[PDB]
């Protein structure tokens, strides 16, 4: 698998979630909340209720979505599951990564935890589930540990949900297989295969003893199951669409549910008739976490597709149950602020600038090469702005863009990274008073990204990238190899890791400075009426207009200045049956001549006048 260098255009600190929360985890001992972000960052908050800013810290090791989080070891020890295919163990009090399990092969979608037996399992699109002892991971002793990876087999389809009971005697998985699979974590023995659901199961819940199970699926139903009776015991149709998040009280009598329809409901499992509309969120519910300080729970924490996290009070259930649908809460008691997510982006024909639109509808102009914002256009019409800022030039694709963090992430690949060769003056890099060379954008950018790396000694000579710019090195298919900040390239152990992970295709150009040649283009040239066999050797780096002057030398059968005079009357190198501007690059003709319903070899028109 080939390796790709990528970086994120962002601020030094991203205090608020930039793409919504997938999973929630509350610590009652220290009154701290944990949000897992789609922006790949876990954040810690103080839910004391009285503080102008609850932001404590942010944990950034992951490079993709954080699907689930688990708070273990009687207080604080966060485990995370991510779409970067890795599982990370964190010292939750001090907030840093300890170990990274790279056992999973695909996105890691869910985690289950057995408090008592202090056990934890991880599953994803791997179709494989992995059991882990929290104590064994947290260990720093390594006294003949010989870590044995214990997997769970059976899952035919991709797993989206996992649940384990308190005692850790039962473990059930939910997948696109619609069927739930149960096992005994202590023995790894297959228990049963509960058939019943119509669709994928995204939420699973087990009782203390693991006797009965609650499940939520995209079929719109909540199913109660008895593992004793070994079959479904009940089905509640509460939502008018998929149900993705569930929480229960300690009694295991009242179930809390939400999903796509954005409505949050509490439902009495005993008497399904009793169904209270808690709220209607501003976006589909992705995950919920109850406040378990009191029974019944005083409040519920709600994570959605939006970056904002909300708390809704459940204190008044009892009074509404006896008397008299109309929802309980209209406004949240406490709101965790959210940032904006970039949902639309457009690369301009100059492949240096990017236009973006975000969830607040704010449009902004960006410079990929200098990895920074340039201007905030505000809530302007995005497609109209795109048109207005149209440049009639062509520059080959040299990078890709992703927005899965809600932030701009630019990715460079071995293939097309080096492809865009533009003049410096064009690139706005005036060099008074010598000449303008043909610079490679991807090259310069690579140099700037690894500017502080000593192996490349300096910079690129033209520009600098923000020193806090994260530089990620990763396999295209999935697995993340190494993430460091640009400024950190200096560190001896960092430079040692760059030495070990940075692939050869980058080494050739940044350190060894063996800059790549160009990849020439050619086209047929002849008179449109008369003149007195094959395309001449040419390049997109050529000014195109200068080649038309060479045609005037054949009619003749200090000279460089006389050839420029031919452009005033002769030459006339038209193409695609239309007039061709001398300032236009040879590469730009491919975006108009051959692009207009014709073969990639269009002949150049020529005339005496």
């Amino acid at each position: 698998r080939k390796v790709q260098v990528s970086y994120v255009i962002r601020d030094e600190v991203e205090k608020y979630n930039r793409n919504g929360v997938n999973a929630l985890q509350l610590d009652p001992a220290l009154n701290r909340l944990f949000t897992a972000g789609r922006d790949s960052i876990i954040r810690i908050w103080s839910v004391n209720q009285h503080k102008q800013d609850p932001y404590i810290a942010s944990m950034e090791h992951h490079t993709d979505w954080v699907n689930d989080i688990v708070l273990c070891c009687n207080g604080k020890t966060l485990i995370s599951a991510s779409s970067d295919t890795t599982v990370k163990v964190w010292n939750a009090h001090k907030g840093f990564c300890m170990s990274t399990l790279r056992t999973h092969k695909d996105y890691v979608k869910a985690l289950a935890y057995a408090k008592d037996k202090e056990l934890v399992a991880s599953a994803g699109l791997d179709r494989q589930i992995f059991l882990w002892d929290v104590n064994t991971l947290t260990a720093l002793t390594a006294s003949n540990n010989t870590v044995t990876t214990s997997s769970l087999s059976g899952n035919k389809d991709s797993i989206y949900s996992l649940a384990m009971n308190q005692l850790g005697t039962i473990i059930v998985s939910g997948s696109t297989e619609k069927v739930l699979r149960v096992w005994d974590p202590r023995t790894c023995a297959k228990l049963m295969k509960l058939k019943g659901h119509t669709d994928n199961v995204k939420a699973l819940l087990l009782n203390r003893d693991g006797t009965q199970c609650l499940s939520g699926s995209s079929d719109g139903t909540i199913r109660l199951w008895s593992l004793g009776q070994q079959r479904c015991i009940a089905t509640y149709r509460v939502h008018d669409e998929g149900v993705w998040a569930l929480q229960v009280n300690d009694a295991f009598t009242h179930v809390y549910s939400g999903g796509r329809d954005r409505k949050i409901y509490c439902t009495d499992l005993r008497n399904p008739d009793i169904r209270v509309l808690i709220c209607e969120e501003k976006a589909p519910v992705l995950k919920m976490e109850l406040d378990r300080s009191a029974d019944p729970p005083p409040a519920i924490w709600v994570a959605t597709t939006k970056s904002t996290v909300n708390k809704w009070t459940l204190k008044g259930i009892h009074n509404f149950r006896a008397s008299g649908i109309t929802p309980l809460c209209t406004q949240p008691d406490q709101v965790i602020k959210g940032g904006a997510s970039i949902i639309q982006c457009h690369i301009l024909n100059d492949k240096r600038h990017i236009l973006t639109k975000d969830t607040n509808n704010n449009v902004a102009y960006w410079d990929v090469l200098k990895a920074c914002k340039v201007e905030d256009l505000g809530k302007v019409d995005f497609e109209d702005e795109i048109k207005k800022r149209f440049k009639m030039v062509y520059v080959p694709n040299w990078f890709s863009v992703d927005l899965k963090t809600g932030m701009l992430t630019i990715t460079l690949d071995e293939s097309d990274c080096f492809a865009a060769w533009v003049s410096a003056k064009d690139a706005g890099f005036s060099s008074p008073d010598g000449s303008d060379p043909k610079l490679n954008l991807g090259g310069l950018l690579l140099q700037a990204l690894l500017e502080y790396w000593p192996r490349t000694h300096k910079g690129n000579g033209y520009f600098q990238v923000p020193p806090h710019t994260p530089v990620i090195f990763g396999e295209a298919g999935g697995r993340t190899l190494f993430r460091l900040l640009c400024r950190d390239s200096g560190g001896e152990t960092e430079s040692m890791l760059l030495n070990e992970t940075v692939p050869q295709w980058v080494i050739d150009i940044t350190v060894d400075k063996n800059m790549p040649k160009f990849x020439x283009x050619x086209x047929x040239x002849x008179x449109x009426x008369x003149x007195x066999x094959x395309x001449x050797x040419x390049x997109x780096x050529x000014x195109x207009x200068x080649x038309x002057x060479x045609x005037x030398x054949x009619x003749x059968x200090x000279x460089x200045x006389x050839x420029x005079x031919x452009x005033x009357x002769x030459x006339x190198x038209x193409x695609x049956x239309x007039x061709x501007x001398x300032x236009x690059x040879x590469x730009x003709x491919x975006x108009x001549x051959x692009x207009x319903x014709x073969x990639x070899x269009x002949x150049x028109x020529x005339x005496x006048x």
Binding site: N397, X591, X600
Partner: protein, 76 residues
């Protein structure tokens, strides 16, 4: 943008393309996943066989489009 190709076994594969991408290039991308050389490949879309000289925009092949990959059975 992303388009789809239905391969010989009926398996669907994805391709990341641009409207300016030519058909030969697309066949090269198919070749990267399946290994079939472009000279052996034939692509049918919307009832029409795609020409190597033409581009995706020319055939108006937009996102989520499914292309049908087929090879050849020669006879005389």
């Amino acid at each position: 943008m992303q388009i789809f190709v239905k391969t010989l076994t009926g398996k669907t594969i994805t391709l990341e393309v641009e409207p300016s991408d030519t058909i030969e290039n697309v066949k090269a991308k198919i070749q990267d996943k399946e290994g079939i050389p472009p000279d052996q490949q034939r692509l049918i879309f919307a009832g029409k066989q795609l020409e190597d000289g033409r581009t995706l925009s020319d055939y108006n092949i937009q996102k989520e489009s499914t292309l049908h990959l087929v090879l050849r059975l020669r006879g005389g």
